[PDB]
Write an enzyme that holds these catalytic residues in place. Structure first.
Site, PDB file in Angstrom:
ATOM      1  N   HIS A   1       0.809  -1.233   0.000  1.00  0.00           N
ATOM      2  CA  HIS A   1       0.000   0.000   0.000  1.00  0.00           C
ATOM      3  C   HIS A   1       0.840   1.281   0.000  1.00  0.00           C
ATOM      4  CE1 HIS A   1      -0.094   0.212   4.605  1.00  0.00           C
ATOM      5  NE2 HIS A   1      -0.213   1.543   4.322  1.00  0.00           N
TER       6      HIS A   1
ATOM      7  N   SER B   1       3.448   2.945   8.276  1.00  0.00           N
ATOM      8  CA  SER B   1       3.180   1.927   7.262  1.00  0.00           C
ATOM      9  C   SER B   1       4.439   1.467   6.549  1.00  0.00           C
ATOM     10  CB  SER B   1       2.196   2.439   6.249  1.00  0.00           C
ATOM     11  OG  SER B   1       0.912   2.448   6.866  1.00  0.00           O
TER      12      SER B   1
END
Ligand SMILES: [Ca+2]
Length: 223
Positions: free
Chosen positions: A40, A177
């Protein structure tokens, strides 16, 4: 990282910052030429930044290396974040030293209850926004399957695990992330998703790296 601590300069030497004009994701250096991150976090035109502590100041131990290629896992599903893993190849090999070092892949998956180290430059608030300049660290346990699946009904796959605290207050957050979850000196997870940050009964969800070792080894041996 919400409710963590200042790691201290270059005590997490496998942590990388992904920069596209600005820091946007973490990653983990697994050898001199390859970084593991989250699918992502994909975008074109990534510069990898190694040996960072303060991402806003050049302190003199950094290496800034362009990515030559990015390989997103072939089954990555951006709706479910299943197989949220990607490999980034550096245009030239990093110099490995005390401040820049690789982390090992696991030969075995890690046990529920194991305390892991999660790190990054992401948001430090569960409400509102405050980004740090220096690398933050958190120790968090791997939660049982059943408590993971109870926290996120119908959303947890066999390629995901939960780590963190069901009471809340301590968690990874956006900007973290892609970064590492290291358990017993092996890369066991990638910061992937969660509902908010540090919310009660909403722990962090991580990509289960031990499911991907064959794919990583295959891909790196051919690219
Ligand atoms: Ca710096």
């Amino acid at each position: 990282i919400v409710g963590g601590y200042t790691c201290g300069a270059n005590t997490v030497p496998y942590q990388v910052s992904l920069n596209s004009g600005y820091h946007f994701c973490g990653g983990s250096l697994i050898n001199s030429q390859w970084v593991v991150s989250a699918a992502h976090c994909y975008k074109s035109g990534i510069q990898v930044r190694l040996g960072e502590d303060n991402i806003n100041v050049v302190e003199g131990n950094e290496q800034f290396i362009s990515a030559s290629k990015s390989i997103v896992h072939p089954s990555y599903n951006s709706n479910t974040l299943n197989n949220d893993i990607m490999l980034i190849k550096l245009k030239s090999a990093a110099s490995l030293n005390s401040r820049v070092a690789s982390i090992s892949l696991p030969t075995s998956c890690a046990s529920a209850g194991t305390q892991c180290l999660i790190s990054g430059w992401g948001n430090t608030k569960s409400s509102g926004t405050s980004y740090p300049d220096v690398l933050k660290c958190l120790k968090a346990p791997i939660l049982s399957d059943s408590s993971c699946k109870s926290a996120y009904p119908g959303q947890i796959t066999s390629n995901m695990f939960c780590a963190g605290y069901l009471e809340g207050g301590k968690d990874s957050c956006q900007g973290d992330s892609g970064g590492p979850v290291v358990c017993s000196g092996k890369l066991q997870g990638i910061v992937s998703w969660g509902s908010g940050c540090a919310q009660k009964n909403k722990p962090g969800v991580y990509t289960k790296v031990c499911n991907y070792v064959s794919w990583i080894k295959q891909t790196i041996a051919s690219n």
